[PDB]
Structures are given as C-alpha cells and as structure tokens.
Design a protein around this ligand. Sequence first.
Ligand SMILES: Cc1nc2ccc3ccc(CNc4ccc5c(c4)CN([C@@H](CCC(=O)O)C(=O)O)C5=O)cc3c2c(=O)[nH]1
Ligand SMILES: Cc1nc2ccc3ccc(CNc4ccc5c(c4)CN([C@@H](CCC(=O)O)C(=O)O)C5=O)cc3c2c(=O)[nH]1
Ligand SMILES: O=c1ccn([C@H]2C[C@H](O)[C@@H](COP(=O)(O)O)O2)c(=O)[nH]1
Ligand SMILES: O=c1ccn([C@H]2C[C@H](O)[C@@H](COP(=O)(O)O)O2)c(=O)[nH]1
Lengths: 264, 264
Amino acid sequence: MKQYLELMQKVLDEGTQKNDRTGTGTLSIFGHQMRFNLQDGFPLVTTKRCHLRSIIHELLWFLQGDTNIAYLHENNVTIWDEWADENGDLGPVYGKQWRAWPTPDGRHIDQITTVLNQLKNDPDSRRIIVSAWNVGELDKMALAPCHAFFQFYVADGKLSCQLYQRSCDVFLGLPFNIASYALLVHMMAQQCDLEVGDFVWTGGDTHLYSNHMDQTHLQLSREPRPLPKLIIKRKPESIFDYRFEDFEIEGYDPHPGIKAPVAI
Amino acid sequence: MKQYLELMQKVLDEGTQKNDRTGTGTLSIFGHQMRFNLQDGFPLVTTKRCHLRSIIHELLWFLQGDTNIAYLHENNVTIWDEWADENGDLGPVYGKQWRAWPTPDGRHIDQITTVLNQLKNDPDSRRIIVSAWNVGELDKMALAPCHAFFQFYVADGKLSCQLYQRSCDVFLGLPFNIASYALLVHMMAQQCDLEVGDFVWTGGDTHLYSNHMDQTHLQLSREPRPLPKLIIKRKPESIFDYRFEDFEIEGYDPHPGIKAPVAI
Ligand SMILES: Cc1nc2ccc3ccc(CNc4ccc5c(c4)CN([C@@H](CCC(=O)O)C(=O)O)C5=O)cc3c2c(=O)[nH]1
Ligand SMILES: Cc1nc2ccc3ccc(CNc4ccc5c(c4)CN([C@@H](CCC(=O)O)C(=O)O)C5=O)cc3c2c(=O)[nH]1
Ligand SMILES: O=c1ccn([C@H]2C[C@H](O)[C@@H](COP(=O)(O)O)O2)c(=O)[nH]1
Ligand SMILES: O=c1ccn([C@H]2C[C@H](O)[C@@H](COP(=O)(O)O)O2)c(=O)[nH]1
C-alpha cells in the first residue's frame, strides 16, 4: 500500500544502522505516523499475498483474554510458539492486560468492556484507551508488548483508532499489526452502531532487519493494487462472540507472497 | 513556533465540533505528529509570552514523585489547585506513576531510574518507556494523565524522545507540555553524556476550546521569533538533583502574552 511502501523507502534512505538484541542489526528510524481511511477499504497489503486467517485468530485470541498459544496452535498460527514456556504459556501478555488488568489491590479491570460502555454512553470521551503496557508485570511477559497502547475516538458517527507501536519490524510484523487493528475498529464499529473512520498508526523504533533487504527491494518494485473490502456476515450478540467464519474479503488480488526469516 | 502555528491552523481547517466533559465545546482533530530538533533551539513559544519558571517547577515536582500541591504553592504554581482535595492531594498522578508504579505483588517500580539505567547500559533497547497510564489507579487520580506515555531512543550519540498525549488543549496546555518534555530530554542527555536529538510530539484528541477562537486567531497573526537557547550551569550528581537555578534561558523575546480561560 502506498503509505506502507513509502515508510519502507524512508527506512532505507534515512534509517540508522543499530545493533539489536538479536545481534542481527537493523536500519532504524524513530517516530512515524500513517493514516488509513477505512472508508477506502481494508488496509491489507497487496504487494505481498497476506493471509487474513492468521490475523483473525490472533485478534480473537486476544479478545478472549488468552495467553496460551494452544488456541493458536489448533489454527496453525505458530509465530508465538518460540516464546511460550513448556506449558504453552506466554505470561500476562496482550489478552490478559486487555480483559483483566489486575489492580494492585486484588481486582481485575476489563478494558474492552469499559471501552464498549464508553463508546455506547460517552462517545465524546477523550479517555477511551486500552493499554497493554502494565509496568508491574512486564517482567512476567515472554516479550514486552510491541503494539502497546491504543485510543478510540468518535466524531460524526465515525469510529477512529490510534495505536502507539513502540517497536516495529517493517517487513514482517507491520502488515499483520495494521490489519489486526483495522479489523478491531470494524468489530467495535458494528457493536456500537458507528461507521468506520481512520486507523492512525504511530511507531517508536521502526526498523527493517538487515536480512530483509533483498525482500524489501523486490516488494518496493510491485504496484500497489486497490484495497479489498471487508464483510462481516453476521452481527454477533457481543464483541466476544465473533468467529472466524464471520469475516470475508473481497477484491483481494495481491502479488504473490514473499518469504523472509524472523529475527529471534 | 512554526510547528505549533501549523497545528493550530490545522485544527481550524480540519477540526470537527465536539462536545466535551467540561461542557465548553471544542474543535477537534484526531492523530497528529510533530518533531522539534532540540539542536535548533529550545521550543518555548515566542508568539505569546511564556514563563519558564512554572514549567521548571512542575517538572521538578514530577521528578520528586510528589502529588501534593504544597510545593507548587510555595512557588506560585496554581494550575493544579482546582483539582486538589482539601489536603492538597491529587491522587497518584504523574509523579507517583513515574517514581513508584505499584505492582500487584507489592513492588514499586521507579521508571525514571530504570530509564536512566537503560540509557547507560542498553541504549539500543526498543523498550525505554515511561508510562503514567496506570489502569488500576485511574479512579484515584484527580485527572487522568494527558501526557501519558513517552519513549526514548539513542542514535548517533543523540537522545530523542516521543511523547503520546491522549488529550491536548492546544491553546493553553501544549506550550507547557512541549517545553516540559524538551527540558526532560536536556536533563537526561546531560546525565547520560549524550547530545540532544529530536522531541517528537504525538496527539490523540487535539483540540481548541470554543472560547479560545479569538485568542487563537490573534496569535496566528504573529510572526514567530527565533528560538531561545537553554543553558545548564551545573551537572548535578543525579537527575533528581537539579535546582530551578541551574537553568538559564537566553535570547527569549516573545510577543506579548494572551490570556484565555481554562475549561474546568
Ligand atoms: C523479529 C520479530 N519478532 C516477532 C515476535 C513475535 C511476533 C508475534 C506476532 C507478530 C505479528 N502478528 C502475526 C500473526 C500471525 C503470524 C505472524 C505474525 C507471522 N506468521 C506466519 C508463521 C510465523 C512464522 O513465520 O514462523 C503465518 O503462519 O502466516 C503468522 O501466522 C509478529 C511477531 C514478531 C515480528 O514481526 N518480528
Ligand atoms: C482544560 C485544561 N485543563 C487543565 C488541567 C490541568 C492542567 C495542568 C497542567 C497543565 C500544563 N502545564 C502547566 C505548568 C504550569 C502552569 C500551567 C500549566 C498554566 N499556568 C499558568 C498559571 C495558571 C494558574 O497557575 O492558575 C502560567 O502560564 O503560569 C501555570 O503555572 C495544563 C492543564 C490543563 C489545560 O491545559 N487545559
Ligand atoms: O506484534 C509485533 C511483535 C513484534 N514486532 C517486532 C518489533 C521488533 O522487531 C521485535 C521485538 O523486539 P524488541 O523490540 O522487544 O527488542 O518484534 C512487531 O513488529 N510486531
Ligand atoms: O498537561 C496537560 C493537562 C491537560 N490538558 C488538557 C487536555 C484536555 O483539554 C484536558 C483534560 O481533559 P480530559 O481529556 O481528561 O477530559 O486538559 C493538556 O493539554 N495538558
């Protein structure tokens, strides 16, 4: 997609060479933002075949407030298998924080339920936020949240979302991250009888791994195509009741997938 | 400053009229990003007069881990007064979250010190973050954090910082929140023997209150002056160690002050 290709080029032209955690090396930029009007179709990359199924199960895994990669296993998403313990556990990652942030004093705060309620009774709120950055528990997580904090906003019957992403693998992670969030807006929008607005993406350390150069270049030379369109075949009784079968994508005609090694 | 003036123009040109909790009414946009290279000069607005002292004292207060207004009083900072109880307390607002975030297992994390250790020992880390967004204590706060989460980055021996501000009163608040963060950056870089990099501001609901329209067009009619210079006259043994007297601003010649009412 234009915005995506443009950020990829910007990493190449201006990125600084950094030595990372995995000792792989990256080209890196700090601070970037991109806007997606959901009115113009689903931001699913067309410059590489992307698979909506991986995207969809991860999201629903989150809404369930799950942190065990089993569910993801029985659906063939394996990205997280390298991070779980022998029990298949990841610690209190995304899902746990989203559905049950533990108060210092015993309780759990359901951030999705709060946000649904705000969206329904106080759309003007400037405090409609979800945070996965639980300082108190970062030590227990297999990996610290990448997609750390997001905020919803309503203006003229449209639901907008901004995500703050502290760390981003432009080639591999970015395309999933974008689609996942785009998808949540749509689900939230339907449960709240609102129309879709903008999906705003802001990143922290935005990088291309030193061994994605060849893949990048190739991608950079493909022509973005018209964005597909999302279809929700039924209005579940709640945000927690979606199923993989409920979603469909029209007009998806991408460029073949491109293979690249994950830096672990 | 060019950047702040362009943001105002933008809210005027693209903002939507929104109701708000204070009942005043606003013009708002959602999602904005701007960058200040700290090397160009200290980002104190020149198109209306600012007072560096009040910004200094509010920051020293945050850094102390203080949440009571007494200190602010002793130094003629009264903005926080409306929010404070009978005892002068605000609840576990910024300062408290910064220096002693309460964990569920009876620990308190000091995020300022953690970020200093990371800058000294692992400046390439993609997780040098400070968050004031404590979900479990929000209900104890006099006001939920506006400037909520910030991340540091080092590149070419330079310190950068990205702030995520969920809610922004562009006319009144912003000038204070830009100078505040820029002084933090200078303080951290001095402690860490780094040079200052960029201060990147990112906003959530970025607004102009209805009752600031005239002040806002008057300000806009002014030509920005050249940015002042910050001089630190000492190198304290720690970040918790600065005094108001350590700082000097040079070359500040602002246009006249403009008063506007705060929406409560
Ligand atoms: C360096 C690095 N590390 C990571 C660690 C954990 C992650 C977890 C989720 C995602 C982004 N979300 C998904 C969600 C689903 C899939 C993938 C990513 C990639 N992937 C492959 C399989 C994963 C693999 O390449 O082995 C696929 O089946 O489509 C997925 O199913 C990225 C990372 C990264 C990432 O992007 N980069
Ligand atoms: C609607 C709204 N509400 C707020 C509530 C609390 C705030 C706390 C701090 C700041 C921003 N940081 C500072 C830091 C110092 C001062 C002030 C703000 C404004 N202020 C006036 C004095 C106002 C007063 O002290 O009564 C000055 O310019 O000196 C200060 O001393 C803004 C708000 C807002 C804000 O900007 N807008
Ligand atoms: O959902 C995700 C998860 C991870 N990453 C990336 C960012 C970095 O490449 C890496 C995480 O490493 P640290 O930033 O924690 O070092 O994985 C993503 O892009 N998206
Ligand atoms: O440092 C600060 C503190 C507050 N505000 C503003 C943003 C909003 O106008 C208001 C807070 O209201 P809510 O967004 O919490 O409703 O104060 C700032 O700009 N800067």
